[PDB]
Amino acid sequence: NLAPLPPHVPEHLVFDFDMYNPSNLSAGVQEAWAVLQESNVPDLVWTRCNGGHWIATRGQLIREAYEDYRHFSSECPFIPREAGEAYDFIPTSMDPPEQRQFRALANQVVGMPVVDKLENRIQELACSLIESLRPQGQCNFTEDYAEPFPIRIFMLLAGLPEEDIPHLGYLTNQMTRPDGSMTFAEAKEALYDYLIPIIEQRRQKPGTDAISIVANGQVNGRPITSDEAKRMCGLLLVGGLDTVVNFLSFSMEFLAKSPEHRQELIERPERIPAACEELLRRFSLVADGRILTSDYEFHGVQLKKGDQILLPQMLSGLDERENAAPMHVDFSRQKVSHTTFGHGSHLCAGQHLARREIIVTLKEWLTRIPDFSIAPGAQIQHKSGIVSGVQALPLVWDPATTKAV
Numbered sequence: 560n561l562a563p564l565p566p567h568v569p570e571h572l573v574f575d576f577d578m579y580n581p582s583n584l585s586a587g588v589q590e591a592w593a594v595l596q597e598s599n600v601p602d603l604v605w606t607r608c609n610g611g612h613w614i615a616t617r618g619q620l621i622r623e624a625y626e627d628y629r630h631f632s633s634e635c636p637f638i639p640r641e642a643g644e645a646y647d648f649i650p651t652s653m654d655p656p657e658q659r660q661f662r663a664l665a666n667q668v669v670g671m672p673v674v675d676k677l678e679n680r681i682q683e684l685a686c687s688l689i690e691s692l693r694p695q696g697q698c699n700f701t702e703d704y705a706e707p708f709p710i711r712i713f714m715l716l717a718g719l720p721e722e723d724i725p726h727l728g729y730l731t732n733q734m735t736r737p738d739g740s741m742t743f744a745e746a747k748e749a750l751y752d753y754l755i756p757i758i759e760q761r762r763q764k765p766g767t768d769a770i771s772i773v774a775n776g777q778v779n780g781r782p783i784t785s786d787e788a789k790r791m792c793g794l795l796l797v798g799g800l801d802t803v804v805n806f807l808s809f810s811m812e813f814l815a816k817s818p819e820h821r822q823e824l825i826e827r828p829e830r831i832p833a834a835c836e837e838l839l840r841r842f843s844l845v846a847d848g849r850i851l852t853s854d855y856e857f858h859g860v861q862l863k864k865g866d867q868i869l870l871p872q873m874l875s876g877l878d879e880r881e882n883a884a885p886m887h888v889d890f891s892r893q894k895v896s897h898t899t900f901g902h903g904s905h906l907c908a909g910q911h912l913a914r915r916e917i918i919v920t921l922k923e924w925l926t927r928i929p930d931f932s933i934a935p936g937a938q939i940q941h942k943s944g945i946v947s948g949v950q951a952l953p954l955v956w957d958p959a960t961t962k963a964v
């Protein structure tokens with residue numbers, strides 16, 4: 560299902576990669592995307608899939624483009640174009656300098672200070688979920704930990720009821736890995752109709768939750784509007800429910816297959832942060848992009864005003880030009896080069912929360928359940944989109960080899 564090749568695109572640059580269903584998905588999603596970095600593929604290519612768009616395949620190009628917001632605007636950051644145009648989240652649908660005052664407020668609510676605020680709840684919940692699973696000797700990790708652990712901490716941070724998780728998660732999934740059951744526009748308006756009354760309630764009677772803080776915050780000297788508060792809160796939801804949730808499954812799938820990597824962390828837990836970095840590199844999972852604000856020649860390639868370009872955050876750290884043996888997980892890498900949390904002005908505002916959830920998960924899981932594996936004969940299926948994911952991760956273990964703390 561290819562869109563007609565636009566007249567300005569040389570055919571030697573054509574490579575029909577489908578970011579929502581890559582040909583090589585069975586081998587793993589990161590492997591499926593890494594075909595873009597084989598010798599037969601140029602640095603910057605055009606796919607006719609999903610409406611037609613560019614893809615930069617090298618970390619150097621991806622970083623350069625994310626840095627140069629003048630040519631590569633965030634106004635339409637999603638593929639396909641209908642999704643990008645509908646996408647109005649704050650601050651991600653804005654360029655500098657407009658982005659600035661909204662970013663400060665985002666950081667107030669999901670940045671470092673809030674991690675330090677919630678540290679104990681994060682630790683408490685991980686221990687609680689894991690201890691509860693430990694004597695079963697089995698679990699479906701996606702639904703049993705990967706989802707409830709980060710999502711409940713986010714609902715806690717946002718003061719929203721856990722009753723709304725299955726609903727919210729669904730709409731959020733629709734914006735990252737669409738079912739086809741609803742357009743991006745449908746999903747957004749569903750999420751907005753959920754948020755709107757809550758925000759109004761909380762502008763009238765301010766709480767201490769993230770939503771109250773955003774909705775009563777200040778930008779450009781004035782009160783934030785109800786619409787703006789909604790557009791920021793919408794993004795916070797997506798980040799809360801469809802990032803770390805997916806990442807945790809990739810990591811745990813890997814660890815289920817590598818006993819030596821597990822023991823490495825169990826014996827020297829001070830290496831856990833560096834290991835988190837490496838896993839974030841190897842199992843990077845995000846791919847959005849930008850839109851050309853004008854005709855622009857970029858590394859020898861003529862880009863036209865209005866062209867969309869996908870700038871896969873996932874690819875930079877997999878680029879062999881940035882990391883030798885990129886598909887190998889190596890906790891001792893002197894430098895873990897990646898752009899897993901993005902690059903430029905829109906660098907992830909929630910990355911400290913994310914790292915915290917990852918590091919707590921690694922430590923607390925391996926403490927109690929050091930020895931586990933994927934269920935016998937189970938086939939693990941990855942899914943691809945703006946944020947990549949795992950359909951299910953059946954794990955098994957002998958409870959005799961586990962340990963309560």
Ligand code: HEM
Pocket residue numbers: 633636649650651652658662665669794795796797798799802803806844845847848872898899900901902904905906907908909910912913
């Ligand atoms: C493994 C976990 C995560 C990954 C890989 C990730 C990745 C990213 C990336 C690549 C961007 C930049 C998008 C762009 O440049 O267009 C971004 C932005 C953002 N993310 Fe994260 N994210 C994660 C977790 C979270 C969490 C838990 C939150 C909490 C709500 C969050 C909140 C945000 C916000 C608010 C922005 C916008 C910052 C701005 O536009 O100035 N993220 N994220």
Ligand SMILES: CC1(C)[C@@H]2CC[C@@]1(C)C(=O)C2
Pocket residue numbers: 648651735794797798802845847945946
């Ligand atoms: C691309 C992202 C990972 C980043 C945070 C959530 C996400 C889906 C966005 O809309 C911005």
Ligand SMILES: [K+]
Pocket residue numbers: 595596597600601602603616617
């Ligand atoms: K390439």
Ligand SMILES: [K+]
Pocket residue numbers: 634635636643644645646647652
């Ligand atoms: K838009």
